[PDB]
Assembly symmetry: C3
Homo-oligomer: 404 residues x 3
Amino acid sequence: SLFMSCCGMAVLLGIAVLLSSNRKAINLRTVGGAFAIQFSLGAFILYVPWGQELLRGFSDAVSNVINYGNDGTSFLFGGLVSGKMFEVFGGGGFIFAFRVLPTLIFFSALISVLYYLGVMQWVIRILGGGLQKALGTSRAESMSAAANIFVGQTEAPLVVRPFVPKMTQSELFAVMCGGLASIAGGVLAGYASMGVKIEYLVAASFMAAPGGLLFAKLMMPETEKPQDKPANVIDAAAGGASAGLQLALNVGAMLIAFIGLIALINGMLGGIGGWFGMPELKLEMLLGWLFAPLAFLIGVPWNEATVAGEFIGLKTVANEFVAYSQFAPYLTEAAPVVLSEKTKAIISFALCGFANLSSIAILLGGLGSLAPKRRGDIARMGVKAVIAGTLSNLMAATIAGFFL
Amino acid sequence: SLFMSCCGMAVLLGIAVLLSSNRKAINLRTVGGAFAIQFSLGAFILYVPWGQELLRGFSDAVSNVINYGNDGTSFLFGGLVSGKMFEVFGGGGFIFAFRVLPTLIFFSALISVLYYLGVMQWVIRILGGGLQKALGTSRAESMSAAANIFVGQTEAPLVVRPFVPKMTQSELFAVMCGGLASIAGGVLAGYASMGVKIEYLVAASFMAAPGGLLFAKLMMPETEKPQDKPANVIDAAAGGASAGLQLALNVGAMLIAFIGLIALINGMLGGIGGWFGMPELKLEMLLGWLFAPLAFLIGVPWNEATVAGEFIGLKTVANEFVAYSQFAPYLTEAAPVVLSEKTKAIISFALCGFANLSSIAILLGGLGSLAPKRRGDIARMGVKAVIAGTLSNLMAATIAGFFL
Amino acid sequence: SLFMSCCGMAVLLGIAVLLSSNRKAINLRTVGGAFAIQFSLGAFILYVPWGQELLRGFSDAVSNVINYGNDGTSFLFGGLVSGKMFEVFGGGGFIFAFRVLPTLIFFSALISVLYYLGVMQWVIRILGGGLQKALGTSRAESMSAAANIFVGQTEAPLVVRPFVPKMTQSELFAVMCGGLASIAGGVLAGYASMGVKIEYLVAASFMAAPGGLLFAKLMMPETEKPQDKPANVIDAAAGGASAGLQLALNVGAMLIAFIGLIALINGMLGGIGGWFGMPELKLEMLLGWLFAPLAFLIGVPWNEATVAGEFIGLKTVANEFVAYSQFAPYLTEAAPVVLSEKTKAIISFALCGFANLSSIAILLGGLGSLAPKRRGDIARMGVKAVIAGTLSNLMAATIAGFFL
Ligand SMILES: CCCCCCCCCCO[C@@H]1O[C@H](CO)[C@@H](O[C@H]2O[C@H](CO)[C@@H](O)[C@H](O)[C@H]2O)[C@H](O)[C@H]1O
Ligand SMILES: CCCCCCCCCCO[C@@H]1O[C@H](CO)[C@@H](O[C@H]2O[C@H](CO)[C@@H](O)[C@H](O)[C@H]2O)[C@H](O)[C@H]1O
Ligand SMILES: CCCCCCCCCCO[C@@H]1O[C@H](CO)[C@@H](O[C@H]2O[C@H](CO)[C@@H](O)[C@H](O)[C@H]2O)[C@H](O)[C@H]1O
Ligand SMILES: Nc1ccn([C@@H]2O[C@H](CO)[C@@H](O)[C@H]2O)c(=O)n1
Ligand SMILES: Nc1ccn([C@@H]2O[C@H](CO)[C@@H](O)[C@H]2O)c(=O)n1
Ligand SMILES: Nc1ccn([C@@H]2O[C@H](CO)[C@@H](O)[C@H]2O)c(=O)n1
Ligand code: NA
Ligand code: NA
Ligand code: NA
């Protein structure tokens, strides 16, 4: 029943302790409160009636903004994003390149506008302030954690830019983990446009802030001593649209290559596996068979662990965008395998994060440009930070599955 | 009758004098001739029979070039830009992204070719030479004004690149105004592909050269003393296509964001306005109500001033591309409001310009790269230059409405 | 019969000798073996039964990879690349921008992956090693020649990057020729997706390695004395996709401009030619009339030389991508002119190369960045290198036509 979930949380906590740089340096107030916040946050917005209402209210607001932004892409691509497409091409009428990718552009512009107005800084200051006061974490790493709820791993540390070059190894590691444990507002709307429940996306985003700090301070406790704009609103929107455009082009090119490469891998795996009497061997079977214990450990039923392992594994070995692309058909009525609603939630939560190996190179560029003499430390702690970010997503998925 | 137009011109001239840096330094020959040229140019090509024939001849030639360039986009997007699209999606068969944006690429390549051959330099030298000889303006600012008829605000000063770092504040201001009062050959073909009459676009482009110098020397008179390539034609075309591609991507991303943001603004304005008994409140109503006196002042009928104010205002607070995108449906048979032909002309002329706040940042980058130690002056005169560019477009619209 | 082909080869060899920097410095072993290899390679894979089987086996493998990569573009553009497109738009259902361009992205990612694994370096080391041992050419220029079979003119010298700044003028010229005589794996799959026979593309690619060295050492004999990575596989794929994206955008923008410009040229040529009683004058007629002797010289029948001259000429004055775009309809059942299978082969081989004037500027950037103090030599030998690359493609076409 609920025993598998509580054991799941214990195992995830245990792995982080075993991989800690110094277990005797672990601050029990910090890691105790961080888990308490992430757990209570899950209890609040997924179990308690009032918290569920606030979550649905924020989600519907997000859903309304997406529809508003869709007027922009409707102007550019016209009938190619209309209802007539489904009458002609059926299911293939949904053109991903025109339906999902342009949303990255609009939300990037919106976020840039909200930064110019000071709305974002206002929310981050409140959330980040409450974290450091309750966990004892430093000012800079707390703000970066709160910022990571809404923006990406490279944009989040920008709110504490002048503090990055001199922050401790534990601080830098937490900053990295904050970005790896979360996603971004732009891609969130993209995943929502692909069928992923917004309530799960918003929840996992907020739970990433304490969850990121949790496993960061578990695996890399503080052993040192920490310390302590566009001309107008229209320029802000333009700059945001430009950054979103570049992102949309990068994501699209990645999806063409990766999905194409996976198809190539499956073709080769069919021939190689055939030598051992398994010609039906594919990448999905390997990932599913290898991540099934992990899926089962976080609350996925025994008969659904293998399928759930495919998506979780693909997110790890590649990225969450590719995983969501393969998981999205399982959210429609034309799903090859009908999954339970709890399993759908667990997969949604466990995928909601930038935790992968390729994100290390991105951290080296974005976060590294803020502190060029610290690129060595980023590369050194890269793998451990990904593991920490993975544990945070898995913990959030276990918590979500518990109250569901 | 015509009294409202002549008063309109007087008011526009009056505002520039009131905002002048030194009214006693205003050269009457310069500002007198500049207005005389812009007025006579309007009289020539919009009223006098022969001038109307030369305008239609140049416009049809432009219209033929656009159709020739459309063979390129027809090859890439095939049936998505064919007549079958209108049979399937109806009005939504016109895909803006494939119909308008690729034209920016072709014309950028063409202009680059005409620069390599020396055709552009030949025309600019004649027009720019006649301006300085009649107005007394300096050599450099005159060529940049003439160049601005065909190319953008950042490409126009390139013909006088080595003179920019040492030109006077009045010269630099005129260069800025020349770009803000005009558009570019690429986007001109785009607006033409959206339904805007080419005759109006060409006319307003040529009237921008004396009009730009007019309000530049009115608001910033000269108080100082002025002074005084690709390997082959195929490389020129390739470089032009590359620049046009980058432009086409920027415009498209901007249109997705801005239109999407306007839709978001309208949603919020509906809720905010509802608090004051106006739930139907939108961005269009605010702009229309605030720019109606300005539209009425330049010759737009009282019962059409509010609608015309929406487009003029949107061009100012954002850019002319967004304004044209909302004005284009009013040029078809399926227009929500049937406007008079004179009103259509006034709006077309008043929108034909890069005069907006975001163009300042663009001037800081493009024009600023030509003179890095002058970026301070560009930022300082930015707002006044936009105002001057706005007055030039409004003057051209008043002149156009007069002879129509 | 076969006398026209052998004379064709002799003429091509003769031109290179006449344009040599020093005919008395020509190494007979080098240029003798290089021609022997290119000729025997053609004999092997186009005439001899076993060699034809190995060619078809490699081609079908290439054809399978393309289909695998098409799963990526099928996900992004959905029904716009499905069979329904041909039912609605007929022949115009084939959208080039979604059918061909995305293939550049996938193959660029694949090649980047094969480089990370060491597969490419392994094949290049074998082919490049056999060339230098048989021709006496230096180590660096041999590897660059072999690398050019699979990758582009700017990516090929990267395998011998630290040797480029100090290599002789003859070596540098050979490196340039190796890239101009060949194409790239990405665009190869593009041309294959346009209808060009893969067997011809693969054959011409392999024949480019000895053919490139052949005319390089003929026109520029050695008179001096020669001398002598991503964090993971997923990062390699991402970087490749990014480079392919940039390439796909450049090619698409070029095709819009160039084809559009050709349409504009044809319009002007119709008016200019009309003055001399030839209003039907077009760019195709000029190129066909001027390259017909060259087409006839390499084995194209007298009544097909003019049509074949259009494609060969267009490849020279522009690029092979534009030429292939105009030659592709001649490979379908709806061809305006039914050509013989041998003529189709000759045109396919003669077009398979980056040999054009615009590739010089590209060599100045790519190859020049590897040796900034050698950009002068690259620009100096630019034209001769293009001629050499042209002769290599023409030789390969003559050889192909001989055994066919
Ligand atoms: C489409 C899906 C198909 C399935 C593909 C699965 C392949 C698994 C990739 C793992 O490769 C490793 O990843 C590390 C992470 O980058 C690299 O470490 C590199 O970076 C580390 C830190 O960032 C350092 O510790 C190392 O020294 C450095 O080698 C390491 O070299 C590399 O072997
Ligand atoms: C989609 C449409 C929705 C409607 C939106 C309308 C909003 C109006 C924007 C105006 O904002 C101002 O614009 C100036 C122009 O850039 C800025 O001046 C900045 O730049 C000037 C000069 O370029 C300087 O004088 C100033 O010091 C400097 O603040 C200024 O800060 C900013 O407040
Ligand atoms: C769409 C198709 C329409 C048909 C168009 C056909 C036009 C033919 C273009 C030829 O122009 C020449 O090309 C050279 C090659 O770049 C240039 O040499 C330049 O570069 C050379 C070496 O790279 C140097 O030798 C020269 O000094 C230098 O002028 C040269 O200037 C230029 O006149
Ligand atoms: N705003 C964003 C969006 C995405 N990303 C990177 O792209 C991968 C796929 O979404 C993510 O996993 C992440 O590596 C990013 O760094 N910042
Ligand atoms: N050639 C061009 C075209 C456009 N622009 C800038 O983009 C805005 C929208 O067209 C314009 O208002 C202007 O700011 C530009 O600077 N140069
Ligand atoms: N990988 C590639 C692909 C293309 N190119 C350049 O682009 C032209 C058209 O394919 C080619 O003729 C060549 O100039 C390149 O340099 N490298
Ligand atoms: Na984040
Ligand atoms: Na201009
Ligand atoms: Na090559």
